[PDB]
Symmetry: C2
Subunit: 134 residues, 2 copies
């Protein structure tokens, strides 16, 4: 019946600044990073920016490295807060990761959903998608 949504797909997301003490090969609990990325829509026009951080939080018996991300996305059409869990192994292996997102402003107000991304190439821009629903 009734559906309201805002979807941005085929995002090209270059990293403008990032600092971290995360051992990429062998991450240790308590290591962190902070980042400032631009986002470009599928037409490589500017969509906005994200500012965020992440922390290696725990390891599972099966080897997953559970990492907690928190960020704010300031886009042409509104503002989104996104935070949650990713397996750092999925990150490194170019698997799609992501976590819940809530609209704060503009078209996203009263919506929520997910902020997702994947590595294509180490130290190359990431692919991202944003999908929020009423």
């Amino acid at each position: 019946g009734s559906h309201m949504s805002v979807v941005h797909e085929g995002i090209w997301e270059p990293q403008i600044r990032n600092e971290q003490n995360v051992n990429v090969a062998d991450p240790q609990v308590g290591q962190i990073g902070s980042y400032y990325d631009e986002l470009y829509d599928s037409s490589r026009e500017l969509l906005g920016i994200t500012i965020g951080r992440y922390e290696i939080r725990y390891k599972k018996v099966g080897g997953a490295v559970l990492t907690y991300y928190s960020e704010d996305l300031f886009l042409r059409d509104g503002i989104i807060h996104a935070e949650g869990w990713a397996d750092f192994n999925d990150v490194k292996n170019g698997v799609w990761v992501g976590y819940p997102a809530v609209g704060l402003d503009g078209v996203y107000r009263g919506l929520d959903g997910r902020r997702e991304w994947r590595v294509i190439e180490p130290d190359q821009p990431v692919e991202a998608r944003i999908s929020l629903h009423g």
Copy 2:
């Protein structure tokens, strides 16, 4: 191939103490509650306790009332931290809700998964399930 899991299903979860300023009929953003529940396994033997809180955080255009829960479960076989989102409408309507959980101690250490529950009857014990995986 390889699977490690701890599952407790058919939990009977009576409320021992709870205080709140949540308007159940018409919840307002910023209202909270805190609770202390016992859990009994499907044999109505004691499994342990949970101590937690919840907060009405935001409303969606479609009418969902997004509520943030945080708790700690102290069980016979270990300790679990669980927190995340539920639609307060799903809660009131006896729909299954729940959110991520991580093992801190005993059999749950190095596992994660979900803590879930549903209302059977207002002011009657809830049904719960716990499912963590390696």
